[PDB]
């Protein structure tokens, strides 16, 4: 009973099907086919063409966007099938209408092709941009990926261009090629576009409980840069009150005294 209650939670967050590295490519296959069941609304304008309804209404805004339930980005749908509300041979099916409104609701079966990239998965991306604190990438030239300065190896050194933009140099001492291979550190869904947080560096690091003891110096770089980003953003669109002194003087806030 002590571990029985916690066991249900582990199975809720358990990765159903893991992505395997194959064909000596080194990259893990993340595109998967999953058959699903939807409960969708049907508009009265689509009462003569219901399959077009379910498609234009709910399935089309679903593609090229991450869906939390399937645990990936819906690349498309295949084989839509409306479940008849009447258990029974004909193409004429029936859907239950809400007592209050003219809209009907039905169960649907459709197969989804989703891009399901879990953490630990090795992926390849084409370098979009490369700043002093991050490297921009594109998985299959459609999905956004980013490798932060701390996730980049220590041996690597960035070089900023004065002419016009910058470039990162690897351990060997040569600039990085168009395509780059990385491991999935985290996947950010909540935002507008799906962003993959990547790592270029990778349990038994304990030297008499040394792994448990955190190196404050290294832990600071990842926290300070995180806070600096969060605070600068919170200062954007910040409306502060205009204060006028009992003389007719407006109090102007400017850290820099001279021009």
Partner 1 sequence: DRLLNSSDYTQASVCRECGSILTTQQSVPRIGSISTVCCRRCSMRFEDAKKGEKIFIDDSQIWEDGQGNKFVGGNETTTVAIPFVLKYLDSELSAMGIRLRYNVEPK
Partner 2 sequence: TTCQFLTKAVLDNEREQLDSPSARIVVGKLNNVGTGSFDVLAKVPNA
Partner 3 sequence: PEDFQQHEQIRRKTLKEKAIPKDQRATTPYMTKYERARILGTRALQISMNAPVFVDLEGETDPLRIAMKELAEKKIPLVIRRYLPDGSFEDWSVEELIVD
Q: Site for partner 2 (CB under 8 A): which residue of 40, 73, 82, 114?
A: 82
Tell me if 130 sits within 8 A of 180, measured CB to CB: no
- Per partner kind, with CB cut-offs from 5 to 8 A, the member of partner 2, partner 3, partner 1, none near residue 45 is partner 3
Helix (H), strand (E) at residue 65:
strand 65-67
- Spatial distance between the Cα atoms of 152 and 198, rounded to a whole number of angstroms: 9
Stretch that binds partner 2, among 27-35, 60-68, 93-101, 179-187 (CB under 8 A): 93-101
Of 85 and 176, the one with the shorter C-beta distance to partner 1 is 85
108 CB-contact burial (10 Å; exposed 0-12 / middle 13-18 / buried 19+)? buried
Work out the angle at residue 49's Cα, subtended by the Cα atoms of residues 46 and 50, and round it to the nearest 5 degrees: 70
By CB under 8 A, tell whether 37 contacts partner 3: yes
Q: Site for partner 3 (CB under 8 A): which residue of 47, 129, 159, 193?
A: 47
CA atoms within 13 A on the CB side of 66: 18
Q: Which residue has the tokens 């290294």?
A: 218
By CB under 8 A, tell whether 6 contacts partner 3: no
Closest contact distance (angstroms) between CB of 187 and partner 3 is 20
- Spatial distance between the Cα atoms of 32 and 217, rounded to a whole number of angstroms: 41
Q: How many residues bind partner 1 (CB under 8 A)?
A: 22
φ and ψ at 107, to 5 degrees?
-85, 140
Closest contact distance (angstroms) between CB of 78 and partner 1 is 23
Taking only Cα atoms into account, the Rg of the chain, rounded to an integer number of angstroms, comes to 27
Q: Site for partner 3 (CB under 8 A): which residue of 101, 204, 234, 258?
A: 101
By CB under 8 A, tell whether 48 contacts partner 3: yes
The site for partner 1 (CB under 8 A) is made up of 9-10, 12-15, 39, 66, 68, 71, 100, 107, 118-119, 186-192, 233
The site for partner 2 (CB under 8 A) is made up of 42, 47-52, 81-82, 85-86, 91-97, 99-100, 104
């Amino acid at each position: 009973n002590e571990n029985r209650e916690t066991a249900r939670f582990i199975k809720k967050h358990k990765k159903q099907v893991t992505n395997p590295i194959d064909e000596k490519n080194g990259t893990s296959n993340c595109i998967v086919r999953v058959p699903i069941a939807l409960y969708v609304s049907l508009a009265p304008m689509y009462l003569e063409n219901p399959l077009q309804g379910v498609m234009k209404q709910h399935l089309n805004p679903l593609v090229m966007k991450y869906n939390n339930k399937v645990g990936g980005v819906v690349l498309g749908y295949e084989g839509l099938k409306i479940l008849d509300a009447d258990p029974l041979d004909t193409s004429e099916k029936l859907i239950k209408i809400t007592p209050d409104t003219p809209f009907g609701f039905t169960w649907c079966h459709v197969n989804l092709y989703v891009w399901q990239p879990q953490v630990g998965d090795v992926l390849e991306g084409y370098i979009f941009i490369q700043s002093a604190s991050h490297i921009g990438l594109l998985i299959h030239d459609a999905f956004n990926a980013s490798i932060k300065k701390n996730n980049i190896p220590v041996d690597w050194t960035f070089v900023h261009n004065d002419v016009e933009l910058g470039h990162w140099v690897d351990s060997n001492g040569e600039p990085i090629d168009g395509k780059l291979r990385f491991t999935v550190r985290n996947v950010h869904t909540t935002g507008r576009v799906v962003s993959v947080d990547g790592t270029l560096i990778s349990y038994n690091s304990s030297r008499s409980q040394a792994e448990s003891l955190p190196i404050v110096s290294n832990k600071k770089i990842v926290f300070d840069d995180e806070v600096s980003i969060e605070n600068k953003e919170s200062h954007k669109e910040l409306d502060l009150p205009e204060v006028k002194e009992d003389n007719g003087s407006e109090i102007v806030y400017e850290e820099n005294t001279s021009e």
